[PDB]
């Protein structure tokens, strides 16, 4: 699984 | 119950993170007693940021991004949709 920032 | 949230970019951007699967589709998972294909979810919310102020909470599951269904979506599809708008984001989320 992957995490991204916004 | 799903709800729609509108978030306006601030200086700290939108102030939330999204975590989920790389691939498309996959095994169904029950969210609040309802079956869905895999859903990306909100993994962090910046306190005092735009998403926090708009009512987004950690653990929220993302059903739609800017009116586009992202049930079973790849992480990339959801990232690209969140960045589609220049300063506004509309999410359909399911809180847990």
């Amino acid at each position: 699984s992957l995490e991204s920032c916004f | 119950s799903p709800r729609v949230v509108r978030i306006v970019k601030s200086e700290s951007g939108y102030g939330f993170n999204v975590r989920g699967q790389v691939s498309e589709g996959g095994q169904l998972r029950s969210i609040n007693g309802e079956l869905y294909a895999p859903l990306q979810h909100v993994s962090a919310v910046l306190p005092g940021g735009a998403a926090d102020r708009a009512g987004v909470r950690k653990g929220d599951r993302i059903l739609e991004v800017n009116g586009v269904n992202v049930e079973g979506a790849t992480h990339k599809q959801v990232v690209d949709l969140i960045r589609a708008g220049e300063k506004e984001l509309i999410l359909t989320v399911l809180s847990v």
Side-chain angles (χ1 to χ4, degrees):
Chain A
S1 79
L2 310 172
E3 182 165 9
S4 299
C5 314
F6 304 97
Chain B
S1 203
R3 74 190 186 284
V4 176
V5 185
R6 161 178 300 90
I7 308 108
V8 178
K9 253 179 175 181
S10 77
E11 291 191 59
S12 54
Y14 296 110
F16 74 105
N17 295 358
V18 175
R19 176 181 283 276
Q21 71 183 18
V22 183
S23 50
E24 200 282 332
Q27 185 165 2
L28 303 189
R29 191 185 164 184
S30 177
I31 312 297
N32 302 332
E34 191 70 36
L35 270 48
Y36 293 89
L39 305 178
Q40 308 281 320
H41 73 274
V42 174
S43 54
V45 177
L46 170 73
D52 186 33
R53 285 186 275 101
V56 179
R57 296 290 173 258
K58 69 174 142 161
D60 284 352
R61 262 60 194 178
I62 301 175
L63 281 171
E64 303 180 305
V65 181
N66 292 322
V68 177
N69 184 285
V70 291
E71 185 173 354
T74 66
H75 188 72
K76 171 174 171 56
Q77 284 167 340
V78 169
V79 171
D80 289 348
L81 282 163
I82 288 172
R83 296 176 173 154
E86 67 185 356
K87 57 196 168 64
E88 183 172 20
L89 172 68
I90 297 176
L91 297 179
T92 303
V93 294
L94 204 49
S95 290
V96 296

